[PDB]
Amino acid sequence: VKPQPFTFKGGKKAVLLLHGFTGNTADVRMLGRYLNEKGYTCHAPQYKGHGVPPEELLSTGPEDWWKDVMDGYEYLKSEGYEQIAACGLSLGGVFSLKLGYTVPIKGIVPMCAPMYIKSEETMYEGVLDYARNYKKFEGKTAEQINAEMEEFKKTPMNTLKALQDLIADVREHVDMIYSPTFVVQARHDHMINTDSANIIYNEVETDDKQLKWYEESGHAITLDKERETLHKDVYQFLETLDWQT
């Protein structure tokens, strides 16, 4: 169905949930529903250019998506939730780490966050596959999709280099994170370099750093078979955080 930002109201423990590149809030909705059933207040913004036709994605970049992340953090603050944890999938996990050394965060849970850059061509191939599937889900025939993709291929995404610079910049500041960190990484991730999980765990400078590998999951770990175990592991980590004060 339709993708939209969601806010699940619960107690004073607040969690900011961040989806990945070419994703949407549905990637973190089941996790937000589980945490809200456990009493957490959950808010998931939707990045600019996501949840809309892919032609609008081409005009957006990390500077737009980061503004959506900060707006989500400030929305929870403006609503009375001063204590916020950050949990994100892939690029959302990168944004979660960036929040860790930028604003007060009770704890961060980067899930399959890439610390290694990929080539623009490799990234753009994923954009093209996302664009083709989006038009497929719009109900268009195969012939109409081929015609629209032919024009789509003539419009390169000029913000992919900035996306590379974002991942490289966060990796150089991982040692400035002192908040508790729960690194979640699927072992059979064919989308990123799984050594990113070791970089985050080894170089974060917090006393409470954790790493768990998921042996039966792919990159989309929140949608794969172990997600119920992931929900419990994330919940049980969030419970150890220094809430209230």
Side-chain angles (χ1 to χ4, degrees), residues 17 33 35 38 46 54 58 76 83 104 107 118 135 159 204 224:
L17 302 166
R33 195 95 68 183
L35 294 178
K38 293 298 186 183
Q46 187 143 283
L58 301 172
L76 284 173
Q83 301 182 303
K118 297 197 299 180
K135 300 172 183 298
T159 56
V204 69
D224 213 331

Side-chain angles (χ1 to χ4, degrees), residues 113-185:
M115 292 283 95
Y116 292 83
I117 65 174
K118 297 197 299 180
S119 68
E120 294 195 36
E121 187 184 49
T122 306
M123 292 181 175
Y124 188 60
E125 282 177 65
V127 171
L128 290 174
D129 282 330
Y130 161 77
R132 178 171 293 272
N133 283 318
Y134 189 96
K135 300 172 183 298
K136 182 184 184 64
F137 301 157
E138 287 182 306
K140 301 173 181 174
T141 69
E143 314 88 60
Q144 294 164 353
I145 296 170
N146 292 329
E148 296 184 8
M149 288 307 300
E150 211 63 32
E151 288 190 343
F152 192 89
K153 275 170 164 280
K154 302 173 185 175
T155 314
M157 187 163 178
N158 297 125
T159 56
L160 293 181
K161 152 73 172 170
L163 181 53
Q164 290 176 331
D165 298 339
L166 165 72
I167 296 173
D169 183 64
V170 173
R171 188 253 183 275
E172 289 295 321
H173 298 63
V174 159
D175 54 63
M176 305 272 72
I177 298 174
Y178 302 114
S179 304
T181 302
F182 178 28
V183 190
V184 168
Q185 180 60 52

Side-chain angles (χ1 to χ4, degrees), residues 36-57:
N36 180 254
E37 286 291 75
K38 293 298 186 183
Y40 286 80
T41 292
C42 301
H43 176 60
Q46 187 143 283
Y47 304 160
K48 193 192 182 73
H50 296 61
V52 295
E55 287 78 12
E56 306 187 20
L57 173 65

